[PDB]
Design an enzyme around this catalytic site. Structure first.
Site, PDB file in Angstrom:
ATOM      1  N   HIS A  41       6.672  -6.445  -0.703  1.00 39.66           N
ATOM      2  CA  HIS A  41       5.989  -6.549   0.573  1.00 39.66           C
ATOM      3  C   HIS A  41       4.549  -6.043   0.522  1.00 39.66           C
ATOM      4  O   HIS A  41       3.838  -6.191   1.523  1.00 39.66           O
ATOM      5  CB  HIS A  41       6.783  -5.866   1.694  1.00 39.66           C
ATOM      6  CG  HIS A  41       6.757  -4.366   1.676  1.00 39.66           C
ATOM      7  ND1 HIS A  41       7.868  -3.609   1.368  1.00 39.66           N
ATOM      8  CD2 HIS A  41       5.787  -3.486   2.022  1.00 39.66           C
ATOM      9  CE1 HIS A  41       7.572  -2.325   1.490  1.00 39.66           C
ATOM     10  NE2 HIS A  41       6.314  -2.223   1.874  1.00 39.66           N
ATOM     11  N   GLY A 143       3.233   4.914   3.316  1.00 41.78           N
ATOM     12  CA  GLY A 143       2.649   4.946   1.994  1.00 41.78           C
ATOM     13  C   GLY A 143       3.624   5.315   0.905  1.00 41.78           C
ATOM     14  O   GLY A 143       3.249   5.287  -0.274  1.00 41.78           O
ATOM     15  N   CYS A 145       6.342   3.723  -0.048  1.00 37.42           N
ATOM     16  CA  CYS A 145       7.058   2.640  -0.707  1.00 37.42           C
ATOM     17  C   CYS A 145       6.720   2.588  -2.191  1.00 37.42           C
ATOM     18  O   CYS A 145       5.594   2.873  -2.611  1.00 37.42           O
ATOM     19  CB  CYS A 145       6.744   1.299  -0.026  1.00 37.42           C
ATOM     20  SG  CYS A 145       7.576   1.229   1.564  1.00 37.42           S
TER      21      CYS A 145
HETATM   22  C1  LIG Z   1       6.180   1.534   2.663  1.00 40.14           C
HETATM   23  O1  LIG Z   1       5.340   0.406   2.616  1.00 40.14           O
HETATM   24  C2  LIG Z   1       6.717   1.674   4.093  1.00 40.14           C
HETATM   25  C3  LIG Z   1       7.444   3.032   4.211  1.00 40.14           C
HETATM   26  C4  LIG Z   1       8.103   3.295   5.615  1.00 40.14           C
HETATM   27  C5  LIG Z   1       7.016   3.608   6.641  1.00 40.14           C
HETATM   28  C6  LIG Z   1       7.489   4.843   7.493  1.00 40.14           C
HETATM   29  N1  LIG Z   1       8.607   5.408   6.738  1.00 40.14           N
HETATM   30  C7  LIG Z   1       8.959   4.552   5.691  1.00 40.14           C
HETATM   31  O2  LIG Z   1       9.877   4.825   4.922  1.00 40.14           O
HETATM   32  N2  LIG Z   1       7.557   0.538   4.462  1.00 40.14           N
HETATM   33  C8  LIG Z   1       7.511  -0.176   5.653  1.00 40.14           C
HETATM   34  O3  LIG Z   1       6.703   0.125   6.551  1.00 40.14           O
HETATM   35  C9  LIG Z   1       8.471  -1.368   5.933  1.00 40.14           C
HETATM   36  C10 LIG Z   1       7.745  -2.705   5.517  1.00 40.14           C
HETATM   37  C11 LIG Z   1       8.585  -3.973   5.783  1.00 40.14           C
HETATM   38  C12 LIG Z   1       9.951  -3.906   5.070  1.00 40.14           C
HETATM   39  C13 LIG Z   1       7.816  -5.266   5.412  1.00 40.14           C
HETATM   40  N3  LIG Z   1       8.874  -1.406   7.332  1.00 40.14           N
HETATM   41  C14 LIG Z   1       9.277  -0.257   8.013  1.00 40.14           C
HETATM   42  O4  LIG Z   1       9.601   0.749   7.394  1.00 40.14           O
HETATM   43  O5  LIG Z   1       9.291  -0.228   9.406  1.00 40.14           O
HETATM   44  C15 LIG Z   1       9.516   1.027  10.094  1.00 40.14           C
HETATM   45  C16 LIG Z   1       8.266   2.018  10.251  1.00 40.14           C
HETATM   46  C17 LIG Z   1       8.659   3.311  11.018  1.00 40.14           C
HETATM   47  C18 LIG Z   1       7.454   4.214  11.418  1.00 40.14           C
HETATM   48  C19 LIG Z   1       7.330   4.363  12.954  1.00 40.14           C
HETATM   49  C20 LIG Z   1       6.745   3.116  13.680  1.00 40.14           C
HETATM   50  C21 LIG Z   1       5.699   2.279  12.887  1.00 40.14           C
HETATM   51  C22 LIG Z   1       5.911   2.237  11.356  1.00 40.14           C
HETATM   52  C23 LIG Z   1       6.134   3.670  10.864  1.00 40.14           C
HETATM   53  C24 LIG Z   1       7.085   1.295  10.957  1.00 40.14           C
END
Ligand SMILES: *[C@@H](O)[C@H](C[C@@H]1CCNC1=O)NC(=O)[C@H](CC(C)C)NC(=O)OC[C@@H]1C[C@@H]2CCC[C@@H](C2)C1
Ligand SMILES: *[C@@H](O)[C@H](C[C@@H]1CCNC1=O)NC(=O)[C@H](CC(C)C)NC(=O)OC[C@H]1C[C@@H]2CCC[C@@H](C2)C1
Lengths: 300, 299
Positions: A41, A143, A145
């Site tokens: 992603h 960050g 991931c």
């Molecule tokens: C790494 O890219 C990231 C890590 C997440 C971010 C917050 N805690 C984590 O473990 N991954 C993502 O953001 C992921 C991407 C999709 C699969 C394309 N989605 C996701 O994790 O959505 C939930 C977060 C939760 C938090 C509160 C609201 C806004 C943001 C941050 C979305």
């Protein structure tokens, strides 16, 4: 003698962490030999995240769209491919710090160490369990991931987890290093619920044995139970059933303490029915289920 | 909230083993010096009642076996500083990180890299209890394992392991060899004072609950630091110091709740109980997360 939640030393893994950037997304990658593994992603924009046709998005990318940095040095991407949810970037340099390693898929109830990284830099290390519902209760922020989970046997690092997402409940989901998710989750920006979680019973029993080894026995009782009668009560309380293999695995702790496995099951049964009455075990007010029997044995 | 350790790699690169006779423990190799507990020079029988100065005069450089893995590091000088041995070696450690030696305060947390025969086994987070013990996980041969914090690129070493107490908790020194607390490196029965709850960390935990939207326990009152300290000690909580007030500064700013207002809220929790409620999914107040730990995991 002591008992704490103990992770593997992380140095062999720290020497593999790099930063991967594509567009305005930055996350971590794992650099082994001449390949960097990271979550696919990273190639998504906002207009993609909701239903990303990854094969169609990836074929539109050029090697130079990927900025890979190991510290002060930029690594040149000379090719890329995708395996399930993980992107594999070929680079023109071998990582000299590559450990002996293997890729494994772990079972629910098994434990592993997580090296949480941000911008390619290691920040913390902690121990996690693969939940029965295939989530992990991690400490992951924006960050994180591409952070990986691992175990170390002798000098060999077995990689079992790469981090991809957080669920609305605050728990976390990800893949093995072949890019297959643990659990029914999907790398799209949608709110995803997990199956009902359950407690890892064999791990609770190992922890009770650990508590005895460290001189606490207040929760023991004079009773016993059959395996099936225990499992009936366990399942009623959303605990995993205990298999005969689980019983066998608890042999060494049973031998070391002189407490038959099924006697410890009768203790846990009383705790499930009576609660802890304000007491604590090994400092905890709740029954801990993220230590395996192997974990306890090694540490004690 | 997880107990989260620092990455251990910078410290793994400094671990060696030190042997005298058959007594083996771990040492810390920084530049061309190896640091280790001085009781490496004791036989097991010496440990019951050691005269370290007399034992050391009988030792020479060539009685010390220092090994990084199986590779011998030749010792070219030795000295004793308090309860640690400093062994000058003929090779500067190429993996030496930027480092400092610090003496931590009770309540502060640190990561421990548990080592055996100079090989790391595991890493975990510890708190220095107010009675200057740590609830560690140490077995025979673990002496010389170190505790540390990492600040940017700099490793601050704060603990070196020496002893287990009858109660099962652990005692050790800073890297200048000065014990934390009233302990000595003699294989004799020693008691730690009665332990107390780490108030500054409980307050950090309450701030963490507020940051996460769990704030039923905030009340409308405040208190002086002295009144709070006097009440807290009646519940076997530690008094706050000025340094504690200062390190809560960032969390106070982040939430807009003055430290002394949070103190009044905690006082009410101590005096009236939880009344069946929970904080961050727990009826127990957690005291092993520092203000820095709370920030590392929330932000
Ligand atoms: C790494 O890219 C990231 C890590 C997440 C971010 C917050 N805690 C984590 O473990 N991954 C993502 O953001 C992921 C991407 C999709 C699969 C394309 N989605 C996701 O994790 O959505 C939930 C977060 C939760 C938090 C509160 C609201 C806004 C943001 C941050 C979305
Ligand atoms: C490293 O050399 C060890 C590590 C110890 C052993 C097991 N767990 C640990 O943390 N340190 C020691 O063996 C020290 C050496 C002396 C201080 C010179 N001794 C020790 O820890 O003894 C424990 C002791 C506690 C009670 C009081 C007297 C006899 C026993 C009960 C054992």
């Amino acid at each position: 003698s002591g008992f704490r939640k103990m992770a593997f030393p992380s140095g062999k893994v720290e020497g593999c962490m790099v930063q991967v950037t594509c567009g305005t997304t930055t996350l971590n990658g794992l650099w082994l030999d001449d390949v960097v593994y990271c979550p696919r992603h990273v190639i998504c924009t906002s207009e993609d995240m909701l239903n990303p046709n990854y094969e169609d998005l990836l074929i539109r990318k050029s090697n130079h769209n990927f900025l890979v940095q190991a510290g002060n040095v930029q690594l040149r991407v000379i090719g890329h491919s995708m395996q399930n949810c993980v992107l594999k970037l070929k680079v023109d340099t071998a990582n000299p710090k590559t450990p002996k390693y293997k890729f494994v898929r772990i079972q629910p109830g098994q434990t592993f160490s997580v090296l949480a990284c941000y911008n390619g830099s290691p920040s913390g290390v902690y121990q996690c369990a693969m939940r029965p519902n295939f989530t992990i209760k991690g400490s992951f922020l924006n960050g994180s991931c591409g952070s990986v989970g691992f175990n170390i046997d002798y000098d060999c690092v077995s990689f079992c987890y790469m981090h991809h997402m957080e669920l609305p409940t605050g728990v976390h989901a990800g893949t093995d290093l072949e890019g297959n998710f643990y659990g029914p989750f999907v790398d799209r920006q949608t709110a995803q619920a997990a199956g009902t979680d359950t407690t890892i019973t064999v791990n609770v029993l190992a922890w009770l044995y650990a508590a005895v080894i460290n001189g606490d026995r207040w929760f023991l009782n004079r009773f016993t139970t059959t395996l099936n009668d225990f499992n009936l009560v366990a399942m009623k309380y959303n605990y995993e059933p205990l298999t005969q293999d689980h019983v066998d695995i608890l042999g060494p702790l049973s031998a070391q303490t002189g407490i038959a496995v099924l006697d410890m099951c009768a203790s846990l049964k009383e705790l499930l029915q009576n609660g802890m009455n304000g007491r604590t075990i090994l400092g905890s007010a709740l029954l801990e289920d993220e230590f395996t029997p192997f974990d306890v044995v090694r540490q004690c």
